[PDB]
Amino acid sequence: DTTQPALLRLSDHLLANYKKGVRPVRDWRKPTTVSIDVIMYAILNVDEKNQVLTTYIWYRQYWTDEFLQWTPEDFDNVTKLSIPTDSIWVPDILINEFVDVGKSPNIPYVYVHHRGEVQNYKPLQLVTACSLDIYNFPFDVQNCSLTFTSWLHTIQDINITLWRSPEEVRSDKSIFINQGEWELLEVFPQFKEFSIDISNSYAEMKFYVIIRRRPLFYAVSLLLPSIFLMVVDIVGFCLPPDSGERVSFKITLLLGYSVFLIIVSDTLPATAIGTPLIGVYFVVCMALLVISLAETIFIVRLVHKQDLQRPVPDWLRHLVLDRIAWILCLGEQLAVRGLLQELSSIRHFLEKRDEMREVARDWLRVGYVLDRLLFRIYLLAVLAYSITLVTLWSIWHYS
Amino acid sequence: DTTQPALLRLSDHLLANYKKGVRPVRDWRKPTTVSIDVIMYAILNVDEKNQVLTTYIWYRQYWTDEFLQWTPEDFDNVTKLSIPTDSIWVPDILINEFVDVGKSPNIPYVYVHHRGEVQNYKPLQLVTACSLDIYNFPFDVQNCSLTFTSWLHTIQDINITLWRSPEEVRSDKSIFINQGEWELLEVFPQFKEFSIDISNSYAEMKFYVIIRRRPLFYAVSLLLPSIFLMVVDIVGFCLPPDSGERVSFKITLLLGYSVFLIIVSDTLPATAIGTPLIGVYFVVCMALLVISLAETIFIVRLVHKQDLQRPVPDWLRHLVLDRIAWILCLGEQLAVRGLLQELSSIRHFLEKRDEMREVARDWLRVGYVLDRLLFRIYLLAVLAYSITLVTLWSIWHYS
Amino acid sequence: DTTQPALLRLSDHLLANYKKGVRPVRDWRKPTTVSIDVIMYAILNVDEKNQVLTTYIWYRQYWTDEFLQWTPEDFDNVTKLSIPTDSIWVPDILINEFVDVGKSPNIPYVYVHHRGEVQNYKPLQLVTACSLDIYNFPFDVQNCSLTFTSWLHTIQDINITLWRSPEEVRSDKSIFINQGEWELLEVFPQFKEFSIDISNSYAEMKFYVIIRRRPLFYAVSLLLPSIFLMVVDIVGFCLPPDSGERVSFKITLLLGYSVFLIIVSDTLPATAIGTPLIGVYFVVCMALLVISLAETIFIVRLVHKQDLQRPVPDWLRHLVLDRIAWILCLGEQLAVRGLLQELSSIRHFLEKRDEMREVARDWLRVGYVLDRLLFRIYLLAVLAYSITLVTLWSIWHYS
Amino acid sequence: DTTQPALLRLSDHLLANYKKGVRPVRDWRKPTTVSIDVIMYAILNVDEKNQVLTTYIWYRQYWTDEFLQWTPEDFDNVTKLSIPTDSIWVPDILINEFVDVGKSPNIPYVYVHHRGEVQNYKPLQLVTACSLDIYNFPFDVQNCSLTFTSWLHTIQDINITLWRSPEEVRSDKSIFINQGEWELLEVFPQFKEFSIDISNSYAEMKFYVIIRRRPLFYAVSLLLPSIFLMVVDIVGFCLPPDSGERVSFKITLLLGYSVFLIIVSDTLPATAIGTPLIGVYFVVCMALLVISLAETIFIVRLVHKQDLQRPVPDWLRHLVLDRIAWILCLGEQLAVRGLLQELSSIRHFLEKRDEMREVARDWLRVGYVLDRLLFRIYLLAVLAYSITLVTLWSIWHYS
């Protein structure tokens, strides 16, 4: 029986007089240089209404003290050892974009070496407010800024450095949960110096993460209802307006766009500066089919069984030949005296009815020619609108 | 051998018989004059249904006690030193408007000086109540209350002061996230007094904060749908009511306006005094399309193939010389005796049918003139209300 | 060097052997009385589906112990002193209607006096269940119950009293947050006693809070939509049913009334005893428009070109000659054989068509007369129901 | 000066050498007997989508101690004494159905007797997972298992016993919050000895709580729109299909059932066993009005100006002579040669129009007889199905 019980001789030796209130150095003029390694793991939820961001990052620590040194000689060759966190000095590195306390797993153990180098592997999910931008909403990048800093100390007590090469944290192809909502290309760290006056300067440092959304599910959620609405009203332009159900088709598909516009408004607020640049594509298409049903009401107004004023020849000998010669399909197009008064009144009434019928035939013929030319012009206009859509999307296939 | 271990000697010297429970003074009659300072950082969310405000500010504290003092000589000339917070005296400054406990990240270290001055850097989230005004809804100036006061001690024990000039916190345009939803005009602190009875007076000192909404999301949300509904029904009056699908147009758009009034009800609540002035614009425009539906149902009632009483000349020859020529165009308009009874029996029915046709022509002509004049009057009324609305709205845009 | 550092001498004197677990008295047969002070500060959230009430109360405590007495004179005229709460005896008073732990900020300081009285200002959030009855839906009053009691103590251990006069807490119109949803008329404290058996008797005292909903924020959207639906269908009765768009207006507003019932159903439920009987007005209004479209289908069935027989004479003579005078001004409704046979064959067909036209004229004339009759009857019923509704609203303009 | 300050001498005699970690027995072969009393307060929310149940329990814990016995006489006759809970032995009575830790107000005090028993009046809220059944939807009864057990101890350590008779638990006339969603029938406790291994036997026992719904909101709320849809299409079968708006009425109420069916899609869940039987009664009456719009499209297909010939004799003797008679009222019904060539085409065209008019009269007469007989058969069918649903709800409602 000798005086070698276990490896708890170190906890008997240097865990009796050491406390956590005082800063473990000898000369107070030399700062405690700390190092930061950031391995991002996953993001959870983006938000622009409350301007808040939720993420989950791994967190490494590297500092060096002076009260926790002993020799590897005659302590049974021990080098590293676990020690609880509530008995050593703990710094206060935190971002200054807090909105709430993030619930983090509480690990109780940290490292210590024989020369004074410690390790602190602990996880934390930080909730944060950051800058947002939606000026190109399906093709977006977010220049967000995380700022590790000391909330209460200065340059002279804690200096934040980085432990490894900045290329190794810029080229971080490490463990990241894919198949989510977003991607990242690279992570850009930067050291920064910030003073506010003489002899009160704090140790800030900046991060620049950039986040990139997949334009895949939002395409199948938003884009194609516009394109089959365009297919169905291009195919539904073709009914003749002499019945009256064409304006019924117009009011029912504008009611369809109305309920679709109620259901699509709950995508992004962008209440501050952000203009819905994708909403311009909606509103110019809505303007063109608004003037389409305006000319629908116009051509229903012109073509009707009215028995009114005769059509003018100036738009009959000039306007008709201008719209037929350029289009492909045009076509060409006493007792015996009482018997005479009766049949004369009968033939006068019948020729008046036949004249009104031929005038109404002329009205519907002019309306049909106008409908055909407007069919050609409107298909040319929607094909120009489709190629205007395509000529903006054709750049970003390679980017 | 020098006996000097570290700067731990000062902490082990003064933390021997010090307790955090007692209020640290030498004379108990002199009040501990404390000083506070406000660094506003962020606002989070509003709710006018529950009358609650959620924000996030940075916060500072200042006091001077008479037990945290020693000589700055012969201790390696140290001036400031970190100390834990749960071993010294902590005040209880709080607001009188708590509805919930905001989760706040603690800072386990505070400063001390050689003459007894301290420093307390800690943030804490403010979930508070605020009397909100909803009379002028899009152009709203608000006025909340953040009463930083004590909870037990009076003026004779704890007196609160400021730290810097009130102009420097009135023009506080420090670190503050932009691109949110509200700006601030100024922050106005003022020191007051409030005693409920004799020998009891607390330290009340308000912080009047003023926020202002950005009227940009509500415009693109619900202002222009009204104006293209206006261009739709203005260009959609123009179909003739002789068919009957104009009634279908009118029922479909008041169904659309009704369902858009349905969905917008559970979007923006306002329950302080009642309905805002924005609902005046809703009630006048629904009155406009109600009287529009009244006139359409009136002109469908007047113009119909009815075979009823002849049109009166007192509204025929009068209205052609009162409205038409003054506003519209001048578009004014046994072999014989037993055999010839069949022609009489035919011509009686023919002249009856022709007379009913000419009377129905007169009915539709009077209806066309009334439709034209009411269309012109309604367009003038809409233009007058539009120029009135823009000449009452164009003031707030020019500062 | 006198033997007085500070007032820490008392804080080390009577905190040397004072325990925190035993109830501080001299004899165990003497109950210690406590006091009750309740300030109805503000409400947070009401609910009837989960049956939970959430509010915040400024609350005070008062009791008297016998171990904390010392003389003021010879201890430098000290009367009051702050002391931590985790070193003294704390009672366990709490209501027995909790559903959740309300987050409340802790208060680490209480008073102490030299005669032995203490003073505890301790707020706590009330999230709790209560008896709610919302039978009278717009004009309601709730007799909710709060039951202050000890959890395990008896009358023989402690006792519950009230501090000031009960009139001063009954008329306690203190600091109260207005401009929300619920007012505060009065509260009613009442001391009771609930002894369940012999030698196990508990001490309780009640609070019957009286709160009243504002009939302004929901009354708008639950009253005037029905009002302009009434003005819409009253102005929409005007068209004749001969065109076929009156049934279109009828199906359109029944679809609007149905989707209005869809949006209004999920507002406030009542599942056990209380009924939605403010919707008895809703069920009589839907009975009104159901019988309205029923007589619409009836008059479309009676009036149509269906080619039926001559109508009933006795119901025609009493309607056209009598009932019209009741309701309005009445309205006063080989050559001999081979030649004439063709004229007679044309004449029989023409006179058959003319007789069918005159019979159909009689059909829609009787239809118009009956339309005017039940139109006047239904407008009399609508004005009677409207004056009944406004006088039943006018009962409650008393207090 | 007598040697008694207060009754603190017993606490000084007990709490000097008593550790809370050891199990308070004199021999390890004697298990401790505990007692269970359950008085349930109220249940809050049911959700079978997550299969979760939330309730609040007033429960008691009675166990027996062997280290805290002393004599009452010569210690001033004191019997019942308060003691904190964090200084004595606390068991681990938990259930094996926790999915979320319920927030509970901790009672810091318990009693102690001089015979050797203590009691703990401790609450905790339960967030439990239960097996739910939604087969019989309105009059449902559920069967949940609150299996009280020890999570780590065995029969050789503890033993779960009862305190009073289980008939007084089954006859629980105590405090229960009425006016909610559910109600109580009975509470049935049951002991169940359960072992899993050799010499590894735990202490289980069962609770089978019984709850019953009061169908006063959901029943009438999903009963009213179906029944006025029934009265609406009963009173709306009666308009004639000759106009063309009867199919507009039918598409209107099928769109109404579309929006009512999609608003009822967000209701109580399924897939525990399958769909409830309340959807079978929905889908069969939807199938019968599918047959109703099928016969509308049948009677519109048959009755139309299609320009065909006379119908087959065997079909018109069965439709206009059989079903119009034996089921209802019998609704019976040089120049002389030049003019010889004239008028022949006129009389041929007039007799062609006359025979087409008479054939079309036969068409809509057969259609009217079919409409009348289908009206009779459809009223009999909906009356039979309605009285069947009424009697199958009426016998099943009784007990």
Add this chain to the structure above:
Amino acid sequence: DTTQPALLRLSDHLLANYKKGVRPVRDWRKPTTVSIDVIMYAILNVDEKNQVLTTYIWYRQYWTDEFLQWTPEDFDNVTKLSIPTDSIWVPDILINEFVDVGKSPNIPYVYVHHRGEVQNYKPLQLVTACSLDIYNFPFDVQNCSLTFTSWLHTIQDINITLWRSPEEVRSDKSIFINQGEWELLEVFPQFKEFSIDISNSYAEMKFYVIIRRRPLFYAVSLLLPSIFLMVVDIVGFCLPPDSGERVSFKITLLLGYSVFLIIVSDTLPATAIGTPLIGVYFVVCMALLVISLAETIFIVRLVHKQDLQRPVPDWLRHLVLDRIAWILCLGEQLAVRGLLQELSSIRHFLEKRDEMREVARDWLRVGYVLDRLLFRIYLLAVLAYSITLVTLWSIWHYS
């Protein structure tokens, strides 16, 4: 007298100089192996949008100690003993894929043996992020991962092993709550060796849990409404398009299917991969009723009183007789001269009307033949799509 109180002597013996900070062996070079025993209890919530998994598991631990040993001799042969968890060594191993810390029930008691092994029965409610797939939406398998790992320690101190056979945890069908949203098939554990560099390795161990959906709720919520509104339009193809209500019927249930396609984006998949397999059967169905609307407007455009010429015989003798012969049965279709001259214009007008009527008869005859042939072709296409759908669905249902 024997001064042996109880079994508290062994607790006072081994809990005298034992510390929970240092690791509990004598030779530090031997890693203490730990064992893992997992039985999953129930899952709570799945979320493909934020990619998070929520479940509740039962959990066990086993390790070997050298400082908590004693002898069974002369201590009343005691083996089972309770000891608090906050006074012994606790490992730090946890899941590498946490997001949020869930509230877990606290079990402060653990067993201890005399040889040096202990029990640890603690539960935990974990919140993890796992890989999901949304390709096969009704019948999916989820190869998830629950990686147990050491967050802070290496191989040289701890070592994660198993406890029982992997077949007994592979066929683990113990106490589990059925009748939920999912159901599990098997749990596949696997040992894993991870060496990131030289002399720094971690002890990971994998869990490949397998869960499978029962398509009962989403089937009855999704697939049969498509079935019966396709029943509605295949029974609604019956009417001829001459009335003008066939287009209105078609666009009405087109709007119904469109708003049901709007509302089906509530429980749809997320941005993980892209379009699900169920979206193909929806887009081909909307293509079917869009081309149905296209042939509807085509047959309305062809058959209308447009006042055009006779149809061309190039497509009349061949195409119209094709579907009449190779398909079912067809239908085989003194002024002497100045007095009688007032009939030529009359007979010309009547024969012109008769010729236009016969041409329009030819128009709707060709339209009726085209309607019948397209009815046959479309029912053949619907039956082919239905037999393709059931021969694709019959494979996965049989399994």
